[PDB]
Design an enzyme around this catalytic site. Structure first.
Site, PDB file in Angstrom:
ATOM      1  N   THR A  51     -23.893   4.575  68.815  1.00 36.60           N
ATOM      2  CA  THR A  51     -24.089   3.238  68.247  1.00 36.60           C
ATOM      3  C   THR A  51     -23.239   3.045  66.987  1.00 36.60           C
ATOM      4  OG1 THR A  51     -26.421   3.432  68.952  1.00 36.60           O
ATOM      5  CG2 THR A  51     -25.803   1.496  67.654  1.00 36.60           C
ATOM      6  N   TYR A  70     -30.808  -4.675  77.208  1.00 34.97           N
ATOM      7  CA  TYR A  70     -30.721  -6.023  77.789  1.00 34.97           C
ATOM      8  C   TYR A  70     -31.529  -6.212  79.086  1.00 34.97           C
ATOM      9  CZ  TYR A  70     -28.580 -10.343  79.694  1.00 34.97           C
ATOM     10  OH  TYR A  70     -28.358 -11.577  80.262  1.00 34.97           O
ATOM     11  N   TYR A  95     -31.354   9.085  74.744  1.00 34.28           N
ATOM     12  CA  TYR A  95     -31.370   8.340  73.491  1.00 34.28           C
ATOM     13  C   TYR A  95     -32.386   7.204  73.581  1.00 34.28           C
ATOM     14  CZ  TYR A  95     -29.345   5.608  69.521  1.00 34.28           C
ATOM     15  OH  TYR A  95     -29.127   4.881  68.376  1.00 34.28           O
ATOM     16  N   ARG A 114     -33.413  -1.073  69.237  1.00 33.76           N
ATOM     17  CA  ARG A 114     -32.156  -1.666  69.695  1.00 33.76           C
ATOM     18  C   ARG A 114     -32.206  -2.149  71.140  1.00 33.76           C
ATOM     19  NH1 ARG A 114     -27.777  -1.652  66.383  1.00 33.76           N
ATOM     20  NH2 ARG A 114     -27.836  -0.188  64.612  1.00 33.76           N
ATOM     21  N   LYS A 144     -32.776  12.074  71.530  1.00 32.81           N
ATOM     22  CA  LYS A 144     -32.545  11.490  70.212  1.00 32.81           C
ATOM     23  C   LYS A 144     -33.609  10.440  70.087  1.00 32.81           C
ATOM     24  CE  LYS A 144     -29.159   8.931  67.486  1.00 32.81           C
ATOM     25  NZ  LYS A 144     -27.927   8.174  67.691  1.00 32.81           N
ATOM     26  N   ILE A 198     -29.679  13.372  64.270  1.00 34.93           N
ATOM     27  CA  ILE A 198     -28.408  12.723  64.571  1.00 34.93           C
ATOM     28  C   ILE A 198     -28.321  11.522  63.636  1.00 34.93           C
ATOM     29  CG2 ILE A 198     -26.981  11.536  66.260  1.00 34.93           C
ATOM     30  CD1 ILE A 198     -28.570  13.394  68.377  1.00 34.93           C
TER      31      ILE A 198
HETATM   32  N1  LIG Z   1     -22.818  -3.365  81.826  1.00 35.09           N
HETATM   33  C1  LIG Z   1     -22.058  -3.980  80.696  1.00 35.09           C
HETATM   34  C2  LIG Z   1     -20.831  -4.747  81.216  1.00 35.09           C
HETATM   35  C3  LIG Z   1     -21.127  -6.091  81.869  1.00 35.09           C
HETATM   36  C4  LIG Z   1     -19.885  -6.647  82.551  1.00 35.09           C
HETATM   37  C5  LIG Z   1     -20.060  -8.101  82.963  1.00 35.09           C
HETATM   38  N2  LIG Z   1     -21.199  -8.329  83.894  1.00 35.09           N
HETATM   39  C6  LIG Z   1     -22.951  -4.881  79.840  1.00 35.09           C
HETATM   40  O1  LIG Z   1     -24.116  -5.125  80.168  1.00 35.09           O
HETATM   41  O2  LIG Z   1     -22.530  -5.382  78.797  1.00 35.09           O
END
Ligand SMILES: N[C@@H](CCCC[NH3+])C(=O)O
Ligand SMILES: N[C@@H](CCCC[NH3+])C(=O)O
Ligand SMILES: N[C@@H](CCCC[NH3+])C(=O)O
Ligand SMILES: N[C@@H](CCCC[NH3+])C(=O)O
Ligand code: NA
Ligand code: NA
Ligand code: NA
Ligand code: NA
Lengths: 307, 307, 307, 307
Positions: free
Chosen positions: C49, C113, C139, C144, C167, C208
């Site tokens: 990171t 995400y 990790y 995050r 980690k 770390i």
């Molecule tokens: N897996 C990566 C690359 C995405 C590429 C576009 N769909 C991300 O989530 O940022």
């Protein structure tokens, strides 16, 4: 005074034994006090959260103060729960407790429900600290009262000649800051049994404990290991201590600690409403995790007699 | 009864005006009440959070109930704050209030500080509902009391013939579920002024409000627009209403609402400790935001007289 | 392997120095590495990171791995950041890294995400651990990535012969449980500099770190004191260490650490967008707090060259 | 353009059908698109969160864009997911998408994992908005990316001639503020299916939806009721809609929506790792709650072919 409490490491926040009919069980007090004193309780907080103080009248607290003082007989220092979320009430009660005497300090919690600002807190604790001969310990616990004292406001209050401590239940980062910038004659206790290991390593003065009711020996073992530079032993105990602490709060405290104490034969009894005893299923697990006991065989919270 | 409160839309949680010495200002009550009734208050809650009830004695609350009933004279239904975090205390007071009479309902908050379990809450509220002739509205606010009644436990309690409502301060998701599955004879109120728009659209019965003190007209304009299918007007008022609600809670309530009412000339006075009045810098900003007023300029929390 | 990293205490998550045009500053790497190795860095994590890995291409990371291995020359073990939120991408890269060679382990973060379930995480990490010769350190950082591996799923994965570490950036309660129930050949690291003191006392294998860039000496002094049973010295360093850690994260990392390193004359350069360098006002405060330095004075995030 | 999307109420965030071997199922696309168009989808977002974009390569997204454009054939406007947590990557891809053409807008999410500051966000979105002929919609979702755009920074970006919207997933208070202070030619969509009722009442332009895959009709019913001033009907639908939304996110999305679509016979297929399909037990409940279907009889996430 500060000197009275200076050497205390394990302060036990004493439960209030109740009869099935809802009245205080004074008969159960001597046995419990002796158990605590035989298991490394070096100081006793009366009428704290663990005592179910919200359900005790001020007059009942005075009776409890008398009953405990009779048994303890100056063997260990005592702290009295004196604060509510009503500054006037807190002022009048601390005056009564200072007059009653026998206490090393009064504990006053950050006001609950009404969510005061830092300045409101300041004027609240200043008024209590100004009210009597009895020195004050601040009880900071956002987990129960939502709002919290910033370390800035805490240290402003710490400079008061009649404020001699804090029972801190926030973060270890906050704990470290208070230890670092503390004025003289000011005690820092954690109120978090799970954090005590870390708090003591950080330089705190002790723990105001629930778990010392049932795990007094291993806490002392851990504290002794820390003090005698055997960190491996202290850590080993701490790692095994955490799930026991967790069990003690796996139903609203002091239900779990009362269940274990009832199993140990100490007649802790039920909890006063709105608190209810731990369900039988939880009781079996709790006893197994905390004290390695095998427990056998709807719940009912009780009410202070209206007669 | 349910019938008394059925048609209420804006229920004001009335402040307690205090003299500068800390005693209740009974003189200021008649003018404040008439103000509310001339600005679309159709029901009044007495001794709620906004009234600074935790700093009032039960006896003082009875004195307030008397003074307000004399002025109101049955024009709007009244709700009495009866609940504390002590079930026995709550039972005794609700019995006093029922005997006093003249109330449509009693408000009982989910117990603060002691953090009861769902079963604790259930028995707490059941005991209060069993205690007297006065029907009970449950007050659910985790933002002040940490814990909260789940909709399941809430609806269990709703089936009690002497529980007739809720003052819900959780989420709109919970509100929707409650509205959907409510039994007959059960009122659903929001206790959050900023949610009043969304709650009314969702099917709520109304709002128990702080903002009604100072912004009763525009709340009525918004509600009327919701009722007359003018959603664009309703939404317009709502979007401008939110920063006003935010200002009213930008310092611990009821400090900001008292500041405005003092500016309006109603002698709401200061707050009782542990609450302090709003800071001078905040006061000007708050008045400007809430009532578009121009305010011309250490704060002091006050105490109930010990005489 | 586990053996390579076994004795590591302070593993630095190395920054990526960028030129003002956005390209990687390979020139600045040799001086920065030697600095770390002269200040008690005993292991280096690359493309973490702190390295701003999400703004680096896989090809750029391979170029960094080459440049660092040339300078380090096997003096300390190296960990390669290999994991993304895309399992296939992560498999392909870890296979590239394994073939590249010269790494003790690969670091794979809990996917960001897309917020996978525990079973998602398990299969994710299992696939990466199955993919190559390079052993994997997990990790875990909900701060995050929102979601987090439970200790149960964590320990399931620990039983994999090609998963050798974690980690951990959760809580000290979780750390204790993991340390207690760890299998053989499994390293437990804290990824939080402010917790390093408490983690080491608890029995963790090391840290770390970001702070090791600028405060490696005092971290080593603290760790040495923990190892030599001088807890009072350790706690003293810790209490003064916390506000320094806080400053390093007072602006999105690695902005503050880069600011200090630039002040120290290491040409860490700016950050790549979406990260911007720390504001001038913050920069002076940060340097003063972290390294007790006097700094003499719009920010611009930079882009990887599209040529 | 803004004009292209102006009248859109229900924008569907299209899933990406996968074969069992992990490759995109292009054969399944036409049937799904026609289903959406037959059930009140008036706009389609491609390569969003619901599409499992983190697991799609940019080149796969372009193939998906082509496949969908062929089927849609200008019947409804289309938005393309163009943003990552890498500003340079986002710049290069939006250029490719603008060049590819056929899109009314590009969606760019607040960067994930790297947690940029407000200024970092500003420079990130400005760069994407400056990069191409394709207008940009900001995707603000702290539930997935931790950090969030303040309304202040949002409205600063809203003033950019090439930023024409927001997919807002925060609070309704924030929603109201943006609706109130929006500049011209700027669209406000909620990305929260459970909030759509409230968002539309507040004055929002529509919803970017997951639930429109399976509950398109009742959403349209609700929206029509709102628009035709039948608030009782709209509320009734909303109250029943909430538990259906909840079921669609009771396992990490898009696992639940894919399970229902597989049951409907649309060959949505499995999810790409790190996401896994919903467990069979959850699938039965999910289908029952969302579409009132009766489902009959370990899970496996798939990988994009490495050949
Ligand atoms: N897996 C990566 C690359 C995405 C590429 C576009 N769909 C991300 O989530 O940022
Ligand atoms: N139940 C009230 C009064 C407590 C009286 C002293 N124990 C409270 O929690 O504040
Ligand atoms: N201050 C105590 C007693 C309140 C008495 C009734 N207003 C409490 O908040 O529980
Ligand atoms: N920016 C993308 C790709 C990272 C490529 C490796 N550093 C992500 O954070 O997932
Ligand atoms: Na003092
Ligand atoms: Na009822
Ligand atoms: Na292993
Ligand atoms: Na714009």
């Amino acid at each position: 005074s500060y000197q009275d409490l200076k050497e205390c490491k394990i302060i036990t926040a004493f439960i209030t034994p109740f009869h099935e009919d809802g009245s205080i069980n004074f008969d159960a007090i001597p046995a419990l006090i002796e158990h605590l004193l035989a298991h490394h309780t070096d100081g006793i907080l009366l009428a704290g959260t663990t005592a179910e103080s919200p359900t005790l009248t001020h007059d009942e607290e005075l009776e409890l103060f008398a009953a405990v003082q009779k048994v303890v007989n100056g063997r260990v220092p005592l702290i009295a729960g004196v604060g509510t979320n009503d500054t006037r009430d807190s002022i009048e009660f601390v005056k009564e407790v200072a007059e009653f005497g026998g206490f090393a300090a009064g504990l006053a919690i950050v006001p609950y429900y009404n969510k005061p600002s830092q300045e409101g807190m300041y004027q609240h604790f200043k008024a209590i600290a100004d009210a009597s001969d009895l020195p004050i310990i601040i009880y900071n616990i956002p987990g129960r009262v939502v709002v919290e004292l910033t370390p800035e406001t805490m240290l402003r209050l710490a400079d008061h000649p009649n404020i001699i401590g804090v029972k801190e239940c926030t973060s270890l980062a906050n704990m470290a800051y208070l230890i670092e910038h503390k004025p003289e004659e000011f005690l820092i206790y954690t109120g978090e049994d799970g954090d005590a290991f870390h708090a003591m390593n950080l330089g705190a003065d002790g723990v105001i404990s629930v778990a010392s009711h049932t795990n007094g020996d291993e806490m002392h073992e851990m504290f002794t290991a820390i003090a005698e530079s055997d960190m491996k032993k202290a850590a080993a105990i701490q790692r095994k201590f955490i799930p026991k602490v967790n069990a003690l709060f796996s139903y609203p405290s002091p239900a779990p600690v009362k269940a274990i104490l009832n199993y140990m034969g100490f007649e802790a009894g039920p909890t006063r409403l709105p608190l209810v005893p731990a369900p039988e299923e939880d009781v079996k697990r709790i006893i197994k995790v905390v004290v390695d006991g095998d427990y056998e065989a709807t719940v009912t919270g009780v009410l202070r007699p209206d007669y």
